Amino acid sequence: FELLHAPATVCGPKKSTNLVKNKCVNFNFNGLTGTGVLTESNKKFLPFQQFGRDIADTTDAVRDPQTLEILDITPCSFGGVSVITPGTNTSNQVAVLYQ
């Protein structure tokens, strides 16, 4: 086999699934497995391209070969959680901050 960035012409047997918008999920296509939301993109594709890229050498734009339309790939909001608490012998309530 070969994993060059080319139009994939041999696939494993899996069924298709309807699109979801504004709810971030995980995804996989033409052998590209990742996690991110699916939505309509403002970008445009020439009629020979399959997937886009970004600065981070990752995938941010994909084309589903079901229907010739352009899709967007973006992971949703992520961050570290912090615990804002007073001293132990002062109270027991805590505060939650999402970064």
Binding site: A56, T58, P75, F78, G79, G80, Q99
Partner: peptide
């Protein structure tokens, strides 16, 4: 002040940037 305004105007995965206090 205009001097510090000019100074401000002349200054231009999984990694995040924490904002200063």
């Amino acid at each position: 002040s205009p001097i510090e305004d000019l100074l401000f105007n002349k200054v231009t995965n999984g990694l995040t940037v924490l904002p200063p206090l």
